Amino acid sequence: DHEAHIKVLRGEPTPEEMAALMAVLASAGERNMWGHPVDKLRYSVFSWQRVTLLERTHMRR
């Protein structure tokens, strides 16, 4: 098991103290490109950002 667990580095609780600890810690613990700013920017007809910003935004998933 490669999950990252909680670890009590120091001391031992009794089972009741462990139950309190864990209950407390547990109790504490779609694209919509419409009007994206990149559409609002004004580009030169030859601006490379039409590739590297605009398409790289609209196409990106």
Measure Cα distances from 20 to 15, 16, 61 in Å. 9, 6, 44
Examine residue 29 and tell whether it contacts another protein (CB under 8 A).
Answer: no
Q: Which is nearer to another protein, 17 or 57 (CB)?
A: 57
Q: Which is nearer to another protein, 17 or 47 (CB)?
A: 47
> Rounded to whole angstroms, how far apart are CA atoms 16 and 58?
55
Examine residue 40 and tell whether it contacts another protein (CB under 8 A).
Answer: yes
Which residues are at the interface with another protein (CB under 8 A)? Answer: 32, 34-35, 37, 39-44, 46-47, 49, 53
